[PDB]
């Protein structure tokens, strides 16, 4: 609940089955390029190789997965401390946002608020977020090494059904926040209790009547057919 | 189907509080090569830590829900081979009674 940052994290295994130098890079929200995992780890605070490798591979007797991490280590080797890692993340925009202090401070915020927004959006949870990234790479390499099958996109257990309640929730949220900005608009206007209760009623009424689950009489892309008229031909119908 | 229901959505905290009280090492203190066979614990896709004897934990969590203490609409799975424990407080999940 709250805001709902639809930020999706991709952890890509570059290079094809038979291509030399098979690197692992990741696409970060509000970040242009794909960062090699190692820089992300140092920007998180996990600075030496092997401490990074410990987060990804949980068995030192799995040379197979480990040899597969040797490229990444070479890829990230150019970056050595937390700062230079954060700066490298900051360099790649934004747009760029030129200024040395600016880019390093940016990337801090992105890792804190945008990267892996579940777990926490709080400050000091680098340990949890890095161990998760490591759990992600473990799963990426487990599949690539033919130890696990690629996920079934059509597994019903991985699917949710937004019913009448959550449907209304998404809508009420959109409305109350539109009301929140209308309350602030009249508070500013008072350079010295006139709150349009119509917005909430009429908004809910619009959606539930049209089936256009989105703000408002200017619908597209708003999602239609959500609310329809109850079939009353037969009881079972 | 006739017996089907949809998960309404519960609170994860009483289960996160319960787990740490039942042997859950927090991820902030994890050291992979020390505890390598450690069954990893997830609650709503959030990695919370590890647990050394999951067999017992799973049994205590199962009878917590079965008694009623953990809501019966909460899902909990122990994938032994993969060394994982995933828990769902989550709203949307389609369930059936058995």
């Amino acid at each position: 609940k709250g805001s709902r940052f639809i930020s999706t994290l991709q952890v890509k295994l570059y290079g094809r089955e038979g291509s030399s130098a098979r690197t692992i890079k990741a696409t970060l929200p509000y970040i242009k390029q794909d960062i090699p995992i190692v820089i992300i780890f140092r920007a998180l605070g996990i600075i030496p190789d092997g401490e990074i490798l410990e987060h990804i591979c949980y068995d030192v007797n799995d040379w197979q997965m480990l040899e597969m991490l040797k490229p990444c280590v070479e890829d990230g080797f150019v970056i050595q401390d937390r700062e230079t890692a954060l700066d490298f993340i900051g360099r790649r925009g934004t747009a760029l946002g030129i200024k040395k202090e600016k880019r390093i401070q940016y990337a801090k915020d992105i890792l804190q608020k945008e990267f892996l927004p579940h777990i926490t959006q709080l400050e000091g949870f680098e340990s949890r977020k890095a161990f998760f990234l490591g759990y992600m790479i473990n799963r990426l390499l487990l599949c690539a090494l033919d130890r696990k099958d690629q996920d079934d996109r059509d597994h019903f257990g991985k699917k949710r059904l937004d019913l009448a309640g959550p449907l209304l929730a998404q809508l009420f949220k959109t409305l109350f926040k539109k009301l929140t900005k209308d309350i602030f608009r009249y508070m500013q206007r008072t350079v010295e209790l006139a709150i349009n209760a119509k917005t909430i009623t009429s908004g809910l009424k619009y959606a539930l009547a049209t089936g256009n689950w989105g703000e408002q009489k200017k619908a597209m892309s708003s999602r239609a057919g959500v609310s329809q008229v109850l079939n009353r031909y037969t009881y079972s119908s | 189907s006739l017996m089907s229901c949809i998960s309404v959505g519960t609170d994860p905290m009483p289960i996160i509080t319960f787990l740490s009280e039942w042997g859950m090492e927090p991820l902030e203190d994890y050291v992979p090569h020390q505890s390598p066979d450690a069954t990893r614990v997830f609650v709503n896709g959030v990695w919370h830590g590890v647990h050394r004897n999951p067999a017992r934990l799973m049994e205590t969590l199962r009878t917590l829900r079965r008694k009623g203490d953990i809501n019966p609409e909460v899902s909990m799975i122990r994938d032994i081979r993969e060394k994982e424990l995933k828990i769902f407080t989550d709203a949307g999940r389609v369930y059936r009674p058995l």
Partner: peptide
């Protein structure tokens, strides 16, 4: 689904970002 929305979910939406330079307390549904 609707019942979880009224008594629970709705109270939460009303106070997440709510508070302005004016705070929104407990909700009542007639």
């Amino acid at each position: 689904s609707f019942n979880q929305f009224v008594d629970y979910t709705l109270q939460d939406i009303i106070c997440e970002d709510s508070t302005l330079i004016i705070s929104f307390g407990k909700i009542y549904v007639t």
